[PDB]
């Protein structure tokens, strides 16, 4: 019965694919060589930087590194706004609240700590510590000041109420370790890429898996939503980036090259969704035309593996972290 | 800088926050990070408890702040968090010499760990504990039950040297070095052994970094 259902799903996928995205997109000019240069360099982190996140004001960012420090940077003036010590230095993810009052972090401690940025005592203190994940914490994103969704290596994703401190929902169905998650613009759905080489779309209100995507060959390490909200891109450990679609429910575009043989650590989109930025293990970061299969630029300012990457909400800058303990802002 | 408040913000960033960052970096370079690996009931817990998610254990022996990270509680995929322990000084691997199924499992695990790409230049301090139990068991049973190709004597020293040579056969990197040690439950100089081992590893790191090759 499961095989028959899978065959029906494959037939439904093949019935819709009348025109490939590469064929239709040939009628427009490419973006050409995207010339982007380093503007700032943040030089406070000592050990390898593993995760970073932007604030919604497009001026403040939070970065997490192996030296057990959450540092908030002023991107315009290079000044450090805050330095938050972490109880566990094995942090693999960090988040910025949309309001700007909170930051979160987590890692191999199996704990998603939440810190309060705007207190009355003038110092940043830890607000809540969320527990319940058996595996390591790999990604966390705020829905609001009270709701946060996390992904873990115990093949589950959860939704928490920060005030209550307990999981509202648990998302189950992955067989491998969940590595990353990305929220929709409306914060009503999210996609999680797992170590079973599959991506699953979830419903936060319903709590059940809606669609599954099985394009990649190795474990997916990074996922990101298209700005429109009905598409997303994945980055896996087979030197491949792929673009899926929620409505079509199948692979749409593939972003790989013969000279690229290393895994992808991070992915990100631009404001219009025309540029797909991906960090690699070539110590670089390759800019991809999303509508085409052609590379458009290289962010070669790092001498170590690029671990994190993101674009501001106004789209005016791109910050890349790496294992060389530096963050660079590119315009 | 063009404004008084901007001047005070720059002063804060460059005078307080960077001061704490520098002090933390100074205090964080005194420690020694060691990865602890082994099997279940292999003495890995009983040696770290004798010296004393993720289990972090730390102690100071000779003005060195050792930090043993017992990752055995992680039931997830090993190939997803093994890169976190890249900058460890060494790896402490514990092997039980009592039984044979876990012996072959430890051979496979040591082969997997030794030839990992993140640990090509990382030395290994290999512990073969429960030597008293191994000798007491081997005085009445042979090692041919474990290794069918064993042709040496069924004596304690010859058998134990055969197992030690079996583990070091998994090393194919000239730069890497395995510091084998024979220990028991009542053994107490384990901290000293780790101290000399990490001292040697640091010497080899200085040789590599000084451009002397």
């Amino acid at each position, epitope marked *: 019965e499961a095989e028959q259902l899978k065959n029906q799903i494959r037939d439904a996928r093949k019935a819709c694919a009348d025109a490939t995205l590469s064929q239709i997109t040939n009628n427009i000019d490419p973006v050409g060589r995207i010339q982007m240069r380093t503007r700032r360099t943040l030089r406070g982190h000592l050990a390898k930087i593993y995760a970073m996140h932007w604030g919604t004001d497009s*001026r403040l960012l939070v970065s997490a590194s192996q030296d057990g420090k959450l540092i908030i940077w002023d991107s315009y003036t290079t000044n450090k*706004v805050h330095a938050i010590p972490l109880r566990s230095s094995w942090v693999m993810t960090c988040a910025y609240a949309p309001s700007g009052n909170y930051v979160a972090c987590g890692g191999l401690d199996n704990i998603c700590s939440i810190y309060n940025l705007k207190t009355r005592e*003038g110092n940043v203190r830890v607000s809540r510590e969320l527990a319940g994940h058996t595996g390591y914490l790999s990604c966390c994103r705020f829905l609001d000041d009270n709701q946060i969704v996390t992904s873990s290596g115990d093949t589950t994703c959860a939704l928490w109420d920060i005030e209550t401190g307990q999981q509202t929902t648990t998302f189950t169905g992955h067989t491998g370790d969940v590595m990353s998650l990305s929220l929709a613009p409306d914060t009503r759905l999210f996609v999680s890429g797992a170590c079973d080489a599959s991506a699953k779309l979830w419903d936060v209100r319903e709590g059940m898996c809606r669609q599954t995507f099985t394009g990649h060959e190795s474990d997916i390490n990074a996922i990101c939503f298209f700005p429109n909200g009905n598409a997303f891109a994945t980055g896996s450990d087979d030197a491949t980036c792929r673009l899926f679609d929620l409505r079509a429910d199948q692979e749409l575009m593939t972003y790989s090259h013969d000279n690229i043989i290393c895994g992808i650590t991070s992915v990100s989109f631009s404001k219009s969704g025309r540029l797909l930025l991906a960090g690699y293990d070539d110590f670089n970061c390759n800019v991809w035309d999303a509508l085409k299969a052609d590379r458009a630029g290289v962010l070669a300012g790092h001498d170590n593996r690029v671990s994190c990457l993101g674009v501001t909400d106004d789209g005016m800058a791109v910050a890349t972290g790496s294992w060389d303990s530096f963050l660079k802002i590119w315009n | 800088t063009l*404004s*008084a*408040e*901007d001047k005070a913000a720059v*002063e*804060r960033s460059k*005078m307080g926050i960077e001061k704490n960052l520098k002090e933390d970096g100074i205090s964080a370079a005194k420690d020694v990070k060691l990865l602890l690996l082994g099997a279940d009931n292999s003495g890995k817990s009983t040696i770290v408890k004798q010296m004393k998610g993720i289990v972090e254990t730390h102690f100071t022996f000779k003005n060195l702040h050792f930090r043993l990270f017992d990752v055995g509680g992680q039931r997830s995929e090993r190939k997803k968090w093994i890169h976190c322990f890249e900058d460890v000084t060494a790896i402490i691997f514990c092997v039980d010499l009592s039984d044979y199924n876990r012996m072959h499992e430890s051979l496979m695990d040591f082969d997997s760990i030794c030839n990992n790409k993140f640990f090509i230049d990382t030395s290994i301090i290999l512990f073969l504990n429960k030597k008293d139990l191994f000798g007491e068991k081997i005085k009445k049973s042979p090692l041919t039950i474990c290794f069918p190709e064993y042709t040496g004597p069924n004596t304690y020293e010859d058998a134990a040297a055969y197992i030690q040579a079996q583990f070091e056969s998994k090393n194919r990197s000239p730069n890497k070095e395995i510091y084998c040690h024979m220990t028991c439950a009542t053994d107490t100089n384990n901290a000293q052994v780790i101290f000399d081992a990490v001292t040697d590893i640091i010497i080899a790191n200085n040789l590599r970094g000084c451009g002397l090759y």
Partner: single-chain antibody
Amino acid sequence: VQLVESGGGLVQPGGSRKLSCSASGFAFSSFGMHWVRQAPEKGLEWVAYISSGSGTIYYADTVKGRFTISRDDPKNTLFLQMTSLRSEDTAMYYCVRSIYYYGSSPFDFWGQGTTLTVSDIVMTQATSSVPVTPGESVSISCRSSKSLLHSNGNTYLYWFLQRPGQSPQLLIYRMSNLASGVPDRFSGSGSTAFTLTISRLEAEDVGVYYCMQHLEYPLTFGAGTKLEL
């Protein structure tokens, strides 16, 4: 948060006294500190400033050399040593905390000042006394000689409301920036002629309103604008 001062009393001319500030409930070391003076003529005047970590120090144009401001963070105490006190030094001095980073609210908390007895960019507040009608919205304006709109977009006009027999309260730190704990009925706007508007005025907001500037190290307060019900 609690700033408490002491060491205020009668001082003979030519004498000396020291002022101490006791702080609790907040991270003292991360905060820069201020000393603000108010003569019995209902006029606020800034005295001295010390930065976080005892770095930058500023003094008023009328107390430089005579006064000294010092602090010790482990004891959470802020000092002000004044020597050769004059008759113009007969006033009550406040202890004000002020932290400085991107998006912070400086001059947020004011202490309970202790009176002392001894026997630029000018701010204009032409309106002095205004009849306050409860339940009716009012407006309070201020004026400046030099424009406070800096090149980085920050216009440094501060609003303080002094309740009768009480310390000033930071209503608004920068223009159109409502502070913490202040009800939403207040609003600030302007450019340079600035204005503070209180839509749907209620009771318990009767007092003297002051405008302040933070553009330049010479720091100037406004004249006392008073709302009398």
